[PDB]
Design goal:
It is classed as oxidoreductase. The chain has 171 residues and is α/β, with parallel strands linked by helices. Helix content is 21%, strand content 18%. It has a single domain, classed as Glutaredoxin, CATH 3.40.30.10. It binds 4-methoxy-1H-indole-2-carbaldehyde (2 copies). One 4-methoxy-1H-indole-2-carbaldehyde binds next to loops.
């Protein structure tokens, strides 16, 4: 079909089928996260909840990295223009919180220019949003199992430690 290769991200089978540039500009094949439980989240530096999200994501990674937890943080400036800096500045901001998980280059998460990984996560059965599937604000979280399937979505108001009770099921 004609829409079978334009909308081809719709039929991807897992997160592992996508690639994305890391915050240094180097393309990363996300199939490397196979066998790991992943939190995928859109981040911002100037949000009221920036400090609580970064600190708790660092907490989670420190507690469960050896269990197979990985965190993929995608900067995004679409929500209140709260991520206006360059990738290099965002990388340095994250270093101030002692971030050891994976920082990616800034993307869009909504609209036609959204990174296709985010287009795909939003249409997964367990990635459904309230009042539509669009990302509603900074620091939405998706939990991804070891096979790259979306298993849970957490809204911008849910601090990262809320995810903790769900993790042992997927390790
Ligand atoms: C796969 O990416 C895919 C399937 C599909 C269908 O299925 C009927 C309709 C429209 C666009 C589509 N993309
Ligand atoms: C990581 O998955 C993991 C599991 C675990 C257990 O299981 C009882 C005990 C202590 C540390 C651990 N880390």
């Amino acid at each position: 079909l004609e829409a079978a290769s334009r909308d081809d991200w719709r039929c991807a089978r897992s997160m592992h089928e996508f690639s994305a540039k890391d915050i240094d500009g180097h393309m990363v094949n996300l199939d490397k996260y196979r066998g790991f439980v992943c939190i995928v989240t859109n981040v911002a530096s100037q949000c009221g909840k920036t400090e609580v999200n970064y600190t708790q994501l660092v907490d989670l990674h420190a507690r469960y990295a050896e269990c197979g937890l990985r965190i993929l943080a995608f900067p995004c400036n679409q929500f209140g223009k709260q991520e206006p800096g360059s990738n290099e500045e965002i990388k340095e901001f994250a270093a101030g919180y002692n971030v050891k998980f994976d920082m990616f280059s800034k993307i869009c998460v909504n609209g036609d220019d959204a990174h296709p990984l985010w287009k795909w996560m939003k249409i997964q059965p367990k990635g459904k949003g309230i009042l539509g599937n669009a990302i509603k604000w900074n620091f939405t979280k998706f939990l991804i199992d070891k096979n790259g399937c979306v298993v849970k979505r957490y809204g911008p108001m849910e601090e990262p430690l809320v995810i903790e009770k769900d993790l042992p099921h997927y390790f």
